[PDB]
């Protein structure tokens, strides 16, 4: 039967005497005005241990609770579950799972629940030992929560397998499983009538599969019943066939956090009266000779909350929120006067949450305690660099080492070469200054084929003209020739596939060393943006990404069509509006920008807005950037300010004045011929590798295609919302991905759109 | 509001930034005040073979929080995988 002990509210007093009480330096426990009063997690047990040790009294669960000793106990909060607050009212209910009869006693666990809200926060699970001889058969059972397996039908022999197994009783008896992912909800009951073999085997729970739109349905039940068992086979099976969910990685060498010396006080007293544990043993020297102990041996939960400090102090760099487990082994007994030097360990990292292991020394040299600890970290936001810091042989050191990053590779390469037939892997390692690409074979074909759909969708007067990539590669074309001045990897077509695969197969080395929290926000520089959201949602597989930046690097190498070299009369700048003036700000640089674009009659806008007055990234009309260039050179040797002489001088005479200086800068600029080098400023420096003018006015014609291959590219039943939501932050828009009338609105301002303006429209028939 | 309208509402939002932010300029100054300010994100890390987004976060930190990040007691660490890798993976030298 479950059990369900009294709804005790949390106090303000109560935590604030148990700050004391196990000698915590926490501030987040202190009472201070704004910020919240939490409950330190170990305080849980006083709301649940008159609910916990009402489970261990049953006629049927029987021993000396005087030489019942404590075996293990901890504290894990559900996924997402906040902990306890100041207010909070908190109800506890437990059951007793496993009755096991050790050949030395009998160890019997029990599984307590606190519910906040109605909700389940934190469950604790504890062992006891009632010591002796237990005959118990009759009174035992085994009543655990089996993890949930998953397991990948990639195969038909495999499937054979599982259907032969009598236990997996389908719904739809013909549903095909083939290429999916079924997880198990098993929970095994086990009467035992001996201390090895079991009585009966009781294994039940339903069988899901993932969809791919992430919704599992109830397609089976697990249902294996028998006699004289030895081991359940269905577990047994998963443990072998099916596969763990959580899988803890663990550090090459683990990190010697610490080893300090927590001092056990001459009482404990302070802590019996707050814990709801009068046991004498504790306190009564009397109660603690006949118990055939050294003394009047320390609360051993005390032992466990006095490390937990410790283990929130110098490994949960001392946040109450963000530590998310703790568990105390009970391995020997410790009296009070004693310094105790406690051995704590990160020896692991699983999933944003850091492994802490630890044992517990004295000055007697000797272990008392053992246990876990899980901490989050969700401090953690990525950047990932752009184009140009590409270099030969890149991503090659991380290649021959990791399979995370070999698999990555290996796979998009293996696409690459099929898909287009060329090595990605041979560009990287050895740079070849020339491709070619042959479309000789059946594979030939099929590779020429997959290039005769590379197409400018570009608008030209409210009409499409679809002009082809590479014009050349006809259905009689025989083999074309990638063309590089230097090196192929230097050419944009190919610098994006690599940078975002290597910046990809780093942040998957990551996911195969686990280094990386799940709430963790993001952001990427121009091109980065893509490796970013590939890496940190899985947004696109990796032969979609790879496919995606492909399509993008042609679409941007012949977004303007070049002389025969291939120097385009376009680029990119970096400005320091500092550098021309410090009065000389961003409004000033946009104003001046705007100013030199309409007078030149050229093309140059600001395209990255970098650092907050030290980097602002403008793209456009070569010519047009080296005329700005010149135009911030005359105005930082002048130190004459706009900003001042448009308000605190004359009205719109500053606009009048600036044409004058923009046709001497822009006459001057005109002069120099067409293949021009921008040739760094006094307040700006020019861009290498980016011949390309990203992002600026030039390639408005060519964003209606980049949306048709996005459409045809980026698939909802991969997109998920809550991967995304709080972390995604665009380029464009410097906001936290919202799906809200707040942000299509914010979007529509920036760049309207008909699909954007169709959904503000109809937001309230797609509200239900 | 329903999973399979909420999937196509994100698949539409996600798909039009990212078919803009193409061609549309990049607002850095404010997405560094969406993580480093509004949500207190405490390591950053540079994903790529060179540093060009650390001198950019650590140089709004020294300008806008340098008063902010020594106000709250917080040690912002800007990090790029292909020079800083030993603190990612925990690696030191003994």
Not at chain 1, 85 to 113: L, R, Y
Not at chain 1, 484 to 510: I, R, V
Not at chain 2, 37 to 52: A, C, Q
Request: glycine content about 6%; hydrophobic content about 40%.
């Amino acid at each position: 039967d479950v059990i369900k002990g009294k709804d005790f509210e949390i106090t303000a007093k109560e935590v604030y005497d148990f700050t004391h009480a196990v000698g915590n330096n926490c501030e987040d426990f202190v009472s201070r005005p704004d910020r919240t009063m939490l409950a330190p997690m170990d305080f849980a047990i006083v709301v649940g241990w008159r609910a916990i040790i009402k489970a261990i009294f049953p006629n049927t669960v029987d021993g000396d609770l005087l030489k019942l000793v404590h075996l293990s106990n901890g504290y894990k909060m559900i996924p997402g579950a906040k902990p306890l607050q100041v207010g909070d009212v908190v109800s506890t209910t437990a059951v007793i799972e496993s009755v096991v009869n050790q050949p030395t006693g009998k160890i019997v666990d029990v599984v307590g629940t606190l519910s906040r809200n109605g909700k389940p926060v934190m469950e604790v699970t504890s062992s006891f030992f009632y010591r002796g001889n237990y005959t118990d058969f009759e009174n035992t059972f085994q009543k655990t929560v089996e993890p949930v397996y998953q397991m990948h039908i990639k195969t038909s022999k495999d499937i054979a397998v599982l259907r032969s197994k009598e236990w997996f009783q389908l719904d739809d008896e013909d549903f095909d499983l083939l290429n999916k992912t079924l997880t198990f909800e098993t929970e095994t009951e086990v009467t035992f009538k001996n201390a090895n073999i079991f009585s009966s085997v009781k294994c039940f729970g339903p069988i899901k599969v993932e969809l791919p739109t992430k919704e599992t349905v109830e397609i089976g039940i697990v249902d294996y019943e028998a006699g004289a068992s030895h081991g359940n086979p269905v577990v047994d099976f998963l443990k072998r066939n099916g596969s763990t969910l959580e899988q803890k990685v663990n550090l090459e060498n683990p990190i010697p956090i610490a080893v300090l010396d927590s001092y056990t006080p001459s009482t404990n007293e302070p802590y019996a009266r707050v814990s709801g544990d009068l046991n004498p043993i504790h306190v009564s020297r009397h109660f603690a000779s006949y118990a055939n102990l050294p003394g009047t041996i320390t609360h051993g939960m005390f032992s466990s909350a006095s490390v937990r400090a410790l283990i929130e102090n110098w490994a949960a760099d001392s946040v109450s929120s963000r530590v998310r487990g703790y568990t105390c082994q009970f391995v020997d007994m410790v009296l009070p006067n004693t310094a105790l030097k406690t051995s704590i360990q990160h020896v692991g990292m699983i999933n944003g949450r850091k492994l802490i292991k630890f044992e517990t020394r004295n000055e007697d040299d000797v272990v008392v305690l053992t246990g876990e600890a899980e901490i989050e970290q969700p401090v953690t936001t990525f950047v990932f660099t752009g184009q140009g810091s590409q270099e030969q042989g890149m991503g090659m050191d991380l290649y021959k080492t990791s399979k995370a990053a070999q698999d990555v590779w290996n796979r998009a390469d293996n696409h690459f070469k099929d898909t287009y037939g060329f090595s990605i892997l041979d560009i990287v390692i050895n740079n070849p200054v020339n491709l070619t690409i042959h479309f000789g074979g059946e594979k030939g074909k099929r590779i020429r084929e997959n290039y005769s759909a590379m197409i400018f969708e570009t608008i030209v007067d409210g009409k499409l003209k679809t002009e082809k990539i590479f014009k050349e590669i006809n259905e009689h074309s025989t083999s074309y020739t990638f063309r590089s001045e230097k090196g192929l990897l230097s050419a944009t077509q190919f610098t994006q596939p690599a940078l975002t695969l290597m910046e990809k197969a780093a942040f998957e080395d990551l996911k195969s060393k686990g280094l990386i929290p799940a709430d963790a926000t993001f952001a990427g520089h121009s091109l980065g943006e893509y490796a970013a959201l590939a890496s940190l949602a899985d947004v696109m597989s990796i032969e979609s990404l790879v496919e995606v930046v492909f399509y993008r690097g042609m679409t941007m190498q012949v977004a303007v069509p070049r002389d025969e070299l291939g120097r385009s009369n376009y680029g990119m700048i970096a400005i320091n509006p500092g550098r021309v003036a410090a009065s000389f700000s961003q409004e000033a640089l946009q104003y001046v920008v705007e100013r030199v674009g309409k007078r030149t009659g050229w093309l140059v806008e600001i395209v990255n807005y970098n650092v907050e007055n030290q980097q602002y990234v403008a793209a456009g009309d070569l010519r047009a950037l080296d005329t700005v260039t010149n135009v911030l050179n005359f105005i930082k040797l002048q130190k004459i300010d706009i900003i001042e002489l448009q308000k605190s001088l004359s009205l719109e005479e500053v606009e009048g004045h600036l044409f004058e200086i923009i046709d001497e800068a822009s006459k001057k600029s005109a002069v120099k011929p067409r293949p021009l080098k921008l040739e760094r400023g006094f307040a700006c420096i020019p861009l290498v590798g980016i011949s390309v003018p990203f992002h600026s006015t030039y390639l408005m014609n060519g964003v209606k295609p980049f949306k048709s291959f996005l459409k045809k590219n980026i698939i909802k039943e991969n997109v998920k919302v809550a991967r995304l939501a709080g972390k995604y932050i665009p380029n464009l828009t410097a906001k936290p991905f919202q799906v809200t009338k707040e942000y299509f609105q914010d979007v529509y301002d920036l760049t309207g759109s008909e699909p954007i303006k169709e959904i503000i429209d109809n937001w309230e028939k797609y509200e239900q | 509001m329903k999973p399979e309208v909420e999937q196509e509402l994100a698949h539409i939002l996600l798909t039009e930034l990212l078919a803009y932010q193409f061609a549309s300029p990049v607002r850095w100054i404010e997405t560094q005040d969406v993580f480093l300010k509004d949500f207190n994100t405490e390591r950053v890390v540079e994903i790529g073979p060179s540093p060009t987004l650390a001198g950019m976060a650590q140089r709004t930190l020294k300008n806008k929080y340098e008063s902010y990040d020594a106000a709250l007691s917080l040690h912002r660490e800007i990090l790029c995988y292909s020079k800083d890798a030993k603190e990612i993976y925990y690696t030191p030298d003994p």
